Design an enzyme around this catalytic site. Structure first.
Site, PDB file in Angstrom:
ATOM      1  N   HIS B  41       0.910  -1.044   0.024  1.00 27.71           N
ATOM      2  CA  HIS B  41       0.000   0.298  -0.407  1.00 27.71           C
ATOM      3  C   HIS B  41       0.791   0.978   0.290  1.00 27.71           C
ATOM      4  O   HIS B  41       0.185   2.156  -0.098  1.00 27.71           O
ATOM      5  CB  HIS B  41      -0.924   0.129   0.934  1.00 27.71           C
ATOM      6  CG  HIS B  41      -0.901   0.329   2.566  1.00 27.71           C
ATOM      7  ND1 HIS B  41      -0.309  -0.697   3.178  1.00 27.71           N
ATOM      8  CD2 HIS B  41       0.015   1.169   3.023  1.00 27.71           C
ATOM      9  CE1 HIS B  41       0.186  -0.305   4.534  1.00 27.71           C
ATOM     10  NE2 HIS B  41       0.453   1.158   4.609  1.00 27.71           N
ATOM     11  N   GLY B 143       2.992   5.229  10.445  1.00 31.50           N
ATOM     12  CA  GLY B 143       4.515   5.613  10.016  1.00 31.50           C
ATOM     13  C   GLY B 143       5.050   4.424  10.201  1.00 31.50           C
ATOM     14  O   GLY B 143       6.557   3.663   9.998  1.00 31.50           O
ATOM     15  N   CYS B 145       3.910   1.643   9.281  1.00 26.38           N
ATOM     16  CA  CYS B 145       3.807  -0.020   8.668  1.00 26.38           C
ATOM     17  C   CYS B 145       5.480   0.135   8.065  1.00 26.38           C
ATOM     18  O   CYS B 145       5.803   0.653   7.604  1.00 26.38           O
ATOM     19  CB  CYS B 145       3.240   0.539   7.769  1.00 26.38           C
ATOM     20  SG  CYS B 145       1.641   1.463   8.195  1.00 26.38           S
TER      21      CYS B 145
HETATM   22  C1  LIG Z   1     -11.161   1.515  21.456  1.00 32.78           C
HETATM   23  N1  LIG Z   1     -10.252   2.176  21.033  1.00 32.78           N
HETATM   24  C2  LIG Z   1      -9.445   1.930  22.501  1.00 32.78           C
HETATM   25  C3  LIG Z   1      -9.119   2.197  20.066  1.00 32.78           C
HETATM   26  C4  LIG Z   1      -8.772   2.717  19.426  1.00 32.78           C
HETATM   27  C5  LIG Z   1      -8.682   2.385  17.537  1.00 32.78           C
HETATM   28  C6  LIG Z   1      -7.808   3.757  17.253  1.00 32.78           C
HETATM   29  N2  LIG Z   1      -7.432   2.889  15.848  1.00 32.78           N
HETATM   30  C7  LIG Z   1      -7.174   3.959  14.643  1.00 32.78           C
HETATM   31  O1  LIG Z   1      -8.260   5.139  14.528  1.00 32.78           O
HETATM   32  C8  LIG Z   1      -6.979   3.605  13.914  1.00 32.78           C
HETATM   33  C9  LIG Z   1      -7.934   3.301  12.215  1.00 32.78           C
HETATM   34  C10 LIG Z   1      -9.122   2.328  12.492  1.00 32.78           C
HETATM   35  C11 LIG Z   1      -9.735   2.215  11.259  1.00 32.78           C
HETATM   36  C12 LIG Z   1     -10.457   3.394  10.887  1.00 32.78           C
HETATM   37  C13 LIG Z   1     -11.544   3.201   9.542  1.00 32.78           C
HETATM   38  C14 LIG Z   1     -10.898   2.238   9.096  1.00 32.78           C
HETATM   39  F1  LIG Z   1     -11.774   2.238   7.156  1.00 32.78           F
HETATM   40  C15 LIG Z   1     -10.101   0.995   9.396  1.00 32.78           C
HETATM   41  C16 LIG Z   1      -9.293   1.472   9.969  1.00 32.78           C
HETATM   42  N3  LIG Z   1      -7.142   2.483  10.885  1.00 32.78           N
HETATM   43  C17 LIG Z   1      -6.112   3.131  10.197  1.00 32.78           C
HETATM   44  O2  LIG Z   1      -6.501   4.591  10.504  1.00 32.78           O
HETATM   45  C18 LIG Z   1      -5.440   2.414   8.891  1.00 32.78           C
HETATM   46  C19 LIG Z   1      -7.064   2.442   7.986  1.00 32.78           C
HETATM   47  C20 LIG Z   1      -6.069   2.050   6.364  1.00 32.78           C
HETATM   48  C21 LIG Z   1      -4.645   2.410   5.620  1.00 32.78           C
HETATM   49  C22 LIG Z   1      -3.958   1.568   4.839  1.00 32.78           C
HETATM   50  C23 LIG Z   1      -4.792   0.466   4.778  1.00 32.78           C
HETATM   51 CL1  LIG Z   1      -3.742  -1.249   3.233  1.00 32.78          CL
HETATM   52  C24 LIG Z   1      -5.517  -0.390   5.587  1.00 32.78           C
HETATM   53  C25 LIG Z   1      -5.987   0.937   6.832  1.00 32.78           C
HETATM   54 CL2  LIG Z   1      -7.269   0.473   8.006  1.00 32.78          CL
HETATM   55  N4  LIG Z   1      -3.846   3.348   8.849  1.00 32.78           N
HETATM   56  C26 LIG Z   1      -3.128   2.301   9.697  1.00 32.78           C
HETATM   57  O3  LIG Z   1      -3.472   1.537   9.803  1.00 32.78           O
HETATM   58  C27 LIG Z   1      -1.542   2.862   8.949  1.00 32.78           C
HETATM   59  N5  LIG Z   1      -1.382   2.268   8.020  1.00 32.78           N
HETATM   60  C28 LIG Z   1      -0.871   3.220   9.811  1.00 32.78           C
HETATM   61  C29 LIG Z   1      -1.674   3.503  11.443  1.00 32.78           C
HETATM   62  C30 LIG Z   1      -2.444   5.417  11.311  1.00 32.78           C
HETATM   63  C31 LIG Z   1      -2.645   5.456  12.286  1.00 32.78           C
HETATM   64  C32 LIG Z   1      -2.927   5.058  13.671  1.00 32.78           C
HETATM   65  C33 LIG Z   1      -2.376   3.652  13.454  1.00 32.78           C
HETATM   66  C34 LIG Z   1      -1.837   2.693  12.507  1.00 32.78           C
HETATM   67  C35 LIG Z   1      -0.666   1.681  12.943  1.00 32.78           C
HETATM   68  N6  LIG Z   1      -0.381   0.875  12.885  1.00 32.78           N
END
Ligand SMILES: CN(C)CCCCNC(=O)C[C@H](Cc1ccc(F)cc1)NC(=O)[C@@H](Cc1ccc(Cl)cc1Cl)NC(=O)[C@H](N)Cc1ccccc1C#N
Ligand SMILES: CN(C)CCCCNC(=O)C[C@H](Cc1ccc(F)cc1)NC(=O)[C@@H](Cc1ccc(Cl)cc1Cl)NC(=O)[C@H](N)Cc1ccccc1C#N
Lengths: 305, 305
Positions: B41, B143, B145
């Site tokens: 990605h 960051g 990943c």
């Molecule tokens: C209940 N409480 C206690 C629990 C607190 C939970 C809060 N957690 C989140 O809000 C994370 C969020 C949840 C989410 C929201 C909507 C959605 F539609 C899918 C997933 N996830 C992302 O934002 C994903 C989106 C994404 C990007 C590319 C791909 Cl290929 C796949 C996906 Cl899913 N970004 C990432 O994982 C980055 N690569 C790395 C990253 C970025 C930012 C933060 C951490 C990391 C890591 N490690």
């Protein structure tokens, strides 16, 4: 998201670990530039350990009594000296992998990474804190003496601990890298007791802020307290008194979460008086006290959930 | 004595971490010989992430769209290919620090060390387990990943995990180093749910053996149970069923402590039904399940207290 006991990457220290042998005694040393640092009790035999006179023992030694191995490569010892409880062995080769480094003597409540080694070979890495009673709750077996504790800041390795011994309680005692023990301990084979330990209050508070930063808020309340009233509770539960210096150190976490420090103290008061009622915080069922405010900032997001 | 969540020394992996940039997207890659492995990605923009067609996105790229930095030294990309969910970038330079390594795809319940990295620079090391629902409870920020999970055996690095994403629950999902996700997940920005998780029974039992090896015996009893009766209790408390294969794997710990596996099961039954009554085991107030039988043997003394 998430929160884990996180050590510093250990590579810069792995390149410094060597094996030091003197007779039948083998342990680990730290090779920096052309000097190898190790616990002075490597020069003791099994009978010497009871009440050793180290000055006497060292005068009867020469350079060729000390075997230093880095990998399978033997290092030539060209000089030896004692500094407090550490032996310094000058070798003919400067370590080409010497990192930028400092020696630091840490305060109780500070944390560091431990690179546990056997026979000069690193075997594992974990996080420790210096307890208020100047022991560490390590994981160490026979042969681990001379393993070091360290922190890393912008490729500068700050060494703060060299492991010397396990007490009868199973906790661990050692020195700074200048050979001065943490706490009242001495390097001889007598049963030594540490002082009664206490809980590191400022670290528990930091860990509660980590929980809020990560989205765990069930333990908060609307109550606030005063520093003096909280410290009355701290005394009752064997917690270190909270200083105004500790309040100020928690400033950045307080500012990121919007929760004043004395507000978090009232939450901690409630947790101490009522326990958790089967809930967890950051996956723990106890109040964790081996994360400093710095550790929390290092690991947690800079934006609160 | 002592027992800690212990990672493998990370140096052999630190020398392999690089930064991979494609447009405005930056993440970590793993540089082994003349190939850099990273999450595919990286080739997505912010709008592509919703429902990316990776074959389409990759065909529109050439070598010069990929910036690889090892330290401050830029690496020349001379070829690119996609394998499942990982991108492979061929570079003009073989990594001189490549360790002996294997790629392994692990089973749920196995543990590994994670080297958390940002912008190609290692920042910390911790222990994880693959949960039964094929997530890991990591500590990862934006960051991270492309950070990898690994085990080490006699200087051979077994890579088993590459980090791709955080789920809405805050747990983490990723791939083996051939790009196949653990679990049902796919690499696109949709809210994905993992299956309900369960507790790794064989690891809890291993951890109870570690406690006995270290001298913690308060939770033992004279009772024994049968495999079938224990598994009825396991079902009730959301524990994985215990197999005869698991019994045999715990053989060496059973033999060192003199406590038959089914004997330890009855202790665990009692702990599940009555809790701990304010006592701790190895400093934990919960039953810990992220130590394998191998982890216990690796860390604990070979002689029982
Ligand atoms: C209940 N409480 C206690 C629990 C607190 C939970 C809060 N957690 C989140 O809000 C994370 C969020 C949840 C989410 C929201 C909507 C959605 F539609 C899918 C997933 N996830 C992302 O934002 C994903 C989106 C994404 C990007 C590319 C791909 Cl290929 C796949 C996906 Cl899913 N970004 C990432 O994982 C980055 N690569 C790395 C990253 C970025 C930012 C933060 C951490 C990391 C890591 N490690
Ligand atoms: C209640 N339960 C739950 C807790 C279980 C607690 C059981 N723990 C022990 O039995 C350890 C034992 C306690 C003890 C007994 C008598 C005594 F008089 C002083 C201390 N300690 C040693 O045997 C010391 C003796 C020694 C040698 C040199 C010097 Cl300079 C000083 C000292 Cl004190 N050996 C070491 O520490 C080795 N260097 C490294 C080592 C060897 C072996 C094992 C671990 C390590 C390490 N790490």
């Amino acid at each position: 998201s998430g929160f884990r006991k996180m050590a510093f990457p250990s590579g810069k220290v792995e390149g410094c670990m060597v094996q030091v042998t003197c007779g039948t005694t083998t342990l680990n040393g730290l090779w920096l530039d052309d000097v190898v640092y190790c616990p002075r009790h490597v020069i003791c035999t099994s009978e010497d350990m009871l009440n050793p006179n180290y000055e006497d023992l060292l005068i009867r030694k020469s350079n060729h009594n000390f075997l230093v191995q880095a990998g399978n490569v033997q290092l030539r010892v060209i000089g030896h000296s004692m500094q407090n409880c550490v032996l310094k062995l000058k070798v003919d080769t400067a370590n080409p992998k010497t990192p930028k480094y400092k020696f630091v003597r840490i305060q109780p409540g500070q944390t560091f990474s431990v690179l546990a080694c056997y026979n000069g070979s690193p075997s594992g890495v974990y996080q420790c804190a210096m307890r208020p009673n100047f022991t560490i709750k390590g994981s160490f077996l026979n042969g681990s003496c001379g393993s070091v504790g360290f922190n890393i800041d912008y490729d500068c390795v700050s060494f703060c601990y060299m492991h010397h011994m396990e007490l009868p309680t199973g906790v661990h005692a050692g020195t700074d890298l200048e050979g001065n023990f943490y706490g009242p301990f001495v390097d001889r084979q007598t049963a030594q007791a540490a002082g009664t330990d206490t809980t590191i209050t400022v670290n528990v508070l930091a860990w509660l802020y980590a929980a809020v930063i990560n989205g765990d808020r069930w333990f908060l309340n609307r109550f606030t307290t005063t520093l003096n009233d909280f410290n009355l509770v701290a005394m009752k539960y064997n917690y270190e008194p909270l200083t105004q210096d500790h309040v100020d150190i928690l400033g950045p976490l307080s500012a990121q979460t919007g929760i004043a420090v004395l507000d978090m103290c009232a939450s901690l008061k409630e947790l101490l008086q009522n326990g958790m009622n089967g809930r967890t915080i950051l996956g723990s069922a106890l109040l964790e006290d081996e994360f400093t405010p710095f550790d929390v900032v290092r690991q947690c997001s800079g934006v609160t959930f």
